[PDB]
Design an enzyme around this catalytic site. Structure first.
Site, short mmCIF file in Angstrom:
data_model
loop_
_atom_site.label_atom_id
_atom_site.label_comp_id
_atom_site.label_asym_id
_atom_site.label_seq_id
_atom_site.Cartn_x
_atom_site.Cartn_y
_atom_site.Cartn_z
N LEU A 17 -29.39 58.94 -75.48
CA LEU A 17 -28.29 58.14 -75.99
C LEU A 17 -28.85 57.03 -76.84
CD1 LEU A 17 -25.00 57.64 -75.59
CD2 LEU A 17 -25.78 56.33 -73.68
N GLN A 88 -30.56 61.84 -72.22
CA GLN A 88 -29.63 62.90 -72.56
C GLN A 88 -30.39 64.04 -73.20
OE1 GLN A 88 -25.64 63.63 -75.06
NE2 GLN A 88 -26.14 61.45 -74.69
N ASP A 242 -39.69 41.61 -73.38
CA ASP A 242 -38.89 42.79 -73.30
C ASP A 242 -37.52 42.48 -72.68
OD1 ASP A 242 -38.08 45.54 -73.02
OD2 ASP A 242 -40.21 46.01 -72.89
N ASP A 288 -39.33 52.19 -70.04
CA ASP A 288 -40.77 52.29 -69.72
C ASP A 288 -41.19 53.74 -69.87
OD1 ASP A 288 -40.76 49.60 -68.99
OD2 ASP A 288 -41.06 49.99 -66.87
N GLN A 292 -41.31 52.34 -74.22
CA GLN A 292 -40.38 51.55 -75.02
C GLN A 292 -40.18 50.06 -74.87
OE1 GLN A 292 -38.88 51.19 -78.55
NE2 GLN A 292 -40.11 52.87 -77.78
N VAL A 296 -44.34 47.57 -74.14
CA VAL A 296 -44.32 46.64 -73.05
C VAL A 296 -43.76 47.22 -71.75
CG1 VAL A 296 -43.54 44.32 -72.30
CG2 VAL A 296 -44.24 44.67 -74.64
N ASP A 303 -49.14 53.83 -67.00
CA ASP A 303 -49.18 54.08 -68.44
C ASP A 303 -48.41 55.37 -68.74
OD1 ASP A 303 -49.82 54.10 -71.18
OD2 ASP A 303 -51.94 54.55 -70.92
P1 LIG Z 1 -30.02 58.28 -71.70
O1 LIG Z 1 -29.67 59.10 -72.87
C1 LIG Z 1 -28.47 58.30 -71.03
C2 LIG Z 1 -28.73 57.49 -69.72
C3 LIG Z 1 -27.23 57.27 -69.07
C4 LIG Z 1 -26.65 55.95 -69.59
C5 LIG Z 1 -25.23 55.62 -69.99
C6 LIG Z 1 -25.01 54.12 -70.50
C7 LIG Z 1 -23.47 54.32 -70.79
C8 LIG Z 1 -22.97 54.12 -72.41
O2 LIG Z 1 -30.86 57.07 -72.23
C9 LIG Z 1 -30.79 56.59 -73.63
C10 LIG Z 1 -31.09 55.12 -73.90
C11 LIG Z 1 -30.58 54.10 -72.81
O3 LIG Z 1 -30.31 52.76 -73.33
C12 LIG Z 1 -29.84 51.85 -72.40
O4 LIG Z 1 -29.16 51.86 -71.26
N1 LIG Z 1 -30.29 50.40 -72.87
C13 LIG Z 1 -29.85 49.25 -71.75
C14 LIG Z 1 -28.44 48.85 -72.29
C15 LIG Z 1 -28.36 47.62 -71.52
C16 LIG Z 1 -27.67 46.48 -71.15
C17 LIG Z 1 -27.25 45.71 -69.92
C18 LIG Z 1 -26.84 44.28 -70.21
C19 LIG Z 1 -26.55 44.04 -68.73
C20 LIG Z 1 -26.06 42.58 -68.43
O5 LIG Z 1 -32.66 55.01 -73.95
C21 LIG Z 1 -32.74 54.20 -75.12
O6 LIG Z 1 -31.86 54.15 -76.01
N2 LIG Z 1 -33.92 53.72 -75.74
C22 LIG Z 1 -34.42 52.67 -77.10
C23 LIG Z 1 -34.64 51.24 -77.26
C24 LIG Z 1 -33.89 51.17 -78.47
C25 LIG Z 1 -33.88 49.69 -78.98
C26 LIG Z 1 -33.04 49.83 -80.29
C27 LIG Z 1 -32.88 48.51 -81.01
C28 LIG Z 1 -32.04 48.89 -82.27
C29 LIG Z 1 -31.80 47.40 -83.05
CA LIG Z 2 -40.29 48.09 -71.06
#
Ligand SMILES: *[P@@](=O)(CCCCCCCC)OC[C@@H](COC(=O)NCCCCCCCC)OC(=O)NCCCCCCCC
Ligand SMILES: [Ca+2]
Length: 320
Positions: A17, A88, A242, A288, A292, A296, A303
């Protein structure tokens, strides 16, 4: 320098996702992973699919992956590939394994919601409390637009509401019915299935692992509270450089309070379980897992670059 990760079939790293191969064309989802594997004699390919969409359907992510798997074989001279999916992605790799066995030699899943996410149920339950239903309209519009702006090819094929529904506990239960695998055990058992799979006369070596930084550690007045086992309590620098270490520990608390138990932030242990479980002991949150947020991780976190490296070695000795 080596041929340690020199598999027989090419490695295809499938994102989850929000993902793409590189965010805005600059930030790699699989941080330094492809590079690390390349140095160690491996042929690695990173898929660019929809960050927001379902896995099945004509315009889904599974078909985008099949199409990509096809071009890789056409570019490599290979006959089959090694699908390594995260989140996903593992659900997407499974689809290609099922619909096109002959082109798939192994499916490896890293923190994949095979049974769904309790956090996806939550976020959807929060959307339903808007009696007008405009939150779903505007927040999906928002999240789809993110998909386009952060996709490296500015892919317009984004359906956020589909991606959130696909990841709910109840919808993934239907997915598994529609796309069964021998690496899946009974729904509601917190048990995996067989280590290998055989479709249409084609053998796939199924593997998987999980991140379990967020463990339930204290129950008071019904309210369960957790600990981020990846970090040194409080003083850990990962909670600084992070934002996802702490964000995932917040989502990870919503999870334990929804019966997930030990999870990586958004995926439970029980849900990540597929084929051959190499580990669930890693003190990793959800990111992690893919080295990602700029390489960090907390101090008690292993690792992940090394783990995907020992796995490519394991795929090599496996004959794939
Ligand atoms: P998976 O595909 C699906 C896991 C099930 C999750 C469903 C969430 C419902 C919409 O994993 C894909 C993603 C997961 O990303 C996250 O959950 N990030 C945490 C969101 C957090 C917030 C909570 C605030 C709480 C107070 O794995 C990632 O996308 N990885 C990439 C890092 C991308 C950084 C991109 C920056 C772009 C400017
Ligand atoms: Ca991390």
């Amino acid at each position: 320098a080596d041929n340690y990760a020199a598999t027989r079939y090419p490695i295809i790293l499938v994102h989850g996702l929000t993902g793409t191969d590189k965010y805005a064309g600059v930030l790699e989802y699989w941080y330094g992973i492809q590079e690390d594997l390349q140095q160690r004699g491996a042929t690695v390919y990173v898929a660019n699919l929809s960050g927001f969409q379902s896995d099945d359907g004509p315009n889904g992510r599974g078909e985008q992956l099949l199409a990509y798997v096809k071009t890789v074989l056409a570019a490599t001279g290979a006959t089959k590939v090694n699908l390594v999916g995260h989140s996903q992605g593992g659900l997407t790799s499974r689809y290609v394994a099922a619909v096109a066995p002959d082109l798939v030699a192994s499916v490896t899943t890293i923190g994949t919601p095979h049974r769904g996410s309790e956090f996806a149920d939550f976020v959807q339950g929060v959307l339903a409390y808007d009696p007008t239903g405009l939150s779903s309209t505007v927040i999906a519009a928002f999240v789809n637009v993110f998909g386009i702006l952060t996709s490296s090819s500015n892919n317009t094929n984004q359906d956020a509401l589909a991606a959130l529904k696909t990841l709910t506990t109840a919808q993934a239960a239907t997915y598994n019915q529609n796309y069964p695998s021998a690496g899946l055990g009974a729904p509601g058992s917190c048990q995996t299935g067989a280590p290998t799979e055989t479709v249409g006369g084609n053998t796939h070596l199924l593997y998987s692992w999980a991140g379990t930084a967020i463990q339930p550690t204290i129950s008071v007045f019904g309210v369960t509270g957790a600990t981020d086992t990846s970090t040194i309590p409080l003083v850990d620098p990962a909670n600084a450089l992070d934002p996802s270490t702490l964000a995932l520990f917040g989502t990870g608390t919503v999870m334990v309070n929804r019966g997930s138990g030990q999870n990586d932030g958004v995926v439970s242990k029980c849900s990540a379980l597929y084929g051959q479980v190499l580990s669930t002991s890693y003190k990793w949150n959800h990111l992690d897992e893919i080295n990602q947020l700029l390489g960090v991780r907390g101090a008690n976190a292993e690792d992940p670059v090394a783990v995907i490296r020992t796995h490519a070695n394991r795929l090599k000795l496996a004959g794939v």
